[PDB]
């Protein structure tokens, strides 16, 4: 794929509808822990252990401790230069009647914190709950989400499980439900929301320029978004610290940290 910042800028200068797909590489530059990489662990588990229907079916207290810890550390995390360039770009182009939309696999909301308004969070949010009984989704920023989680979630190896009785985990406050809440996060093996996928499809079908920033392009169906864009002939530009299995299918590959390359690209 092409390495020419010059040529990308010529496309960028003319684009009227830009889609930006963002993955964990954008969050990682803010020091947000993914618990995904080699050695990237919570106590004795990684996300593939605890971010699953299985985990929550076996030990919902431990899954909540993990998500409580992740919610809490977000208080010490801020958007990076990549989030900021993306947010500033949407604002500058919006004034010009040009559309920028972010499709993110990230659940940390840092795109929002940076000011992005046109956002599609396809994997949900650390700061949303869903009731396992009635299905209602709510925003929730409370630290701690419930009193039984106060001071829990510590990540050090050997930390004892809080073993909170499920009645003392976060509970649906909808009149008459009181069911058990889970994080409104898409876990491995779960389907994405068809309503959200419909919105994603609308942006993919109408955009004229597409950026894929900080994703390995192995998580599906997100790994297929940029290919159906290039099919129309639309330029796809990949911003990653390393090549991915999808690199050779893109018009541009700009190697390096997103927070280093994105400000130049979106300038």
């Amino acid at each position: 794929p092409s390495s020419s910042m010059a040529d990308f800028r010529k496309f960028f200068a003319k684009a009227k509808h830009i889609v930006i797909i963002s993955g964990a590489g954008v969050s990682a530059e803010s020091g947000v822990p993914t618990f995904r990489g080699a050695g990237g662990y919570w106590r004795k588990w990684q996300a593939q252990d605890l971010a699953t229907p299985l985990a929550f079916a076996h030990n919902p207290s431990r899954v909540w401790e993990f998500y409580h810890y992740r919610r809490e550390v977000m208080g010490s995390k801020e958007p990076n230069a990549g989030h900021r360039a993306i947010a500033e770009c949407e604002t500058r182009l919006g004034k010009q009647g040009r559309r920028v939309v972010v499709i993110t696999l990230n659940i940390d909301e840092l795109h929002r914190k940076a000011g992005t308004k046109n956002l599609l969070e396809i994997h949900g949010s650390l700061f949303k709950t869903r009731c396992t009984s009635c299905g209602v989704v709510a925003e929730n920023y409370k630290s701690p989400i419930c009193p039984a989680l106060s001071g829990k979630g510590a990540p050090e190896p050997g930390t004892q499980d809080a073993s909170i009785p499920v009645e003392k985990l976060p509970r649906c406050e909808e009149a008459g439900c009181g069911g058990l809440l889970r994080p409104h996060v898409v876990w491995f093996g779960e389907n994405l929301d068809p309503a959200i996928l419909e919105e994603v499809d609308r942006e993919l079908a109408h955009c004229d320029l597409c950026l894929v920033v900080g994703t390995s392009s192995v998580v599906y169906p997100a790994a297929m978004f940029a290919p159906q864009v290039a099919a129309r002939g639309v330029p796809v530009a990949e911003f990653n610290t390393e090549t991915t299995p999808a690199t050779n299918r893109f018009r541009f590959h700009f190697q390096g940290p997103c927070g280093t390359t994105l400000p130049e690209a979106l300038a």
Binding site: V219, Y220, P221
Partner: peptide, 4 residues
Amino acid sequence: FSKQ
């Protein structure tokens, strides 16, 4: 579709 499902998350990989």
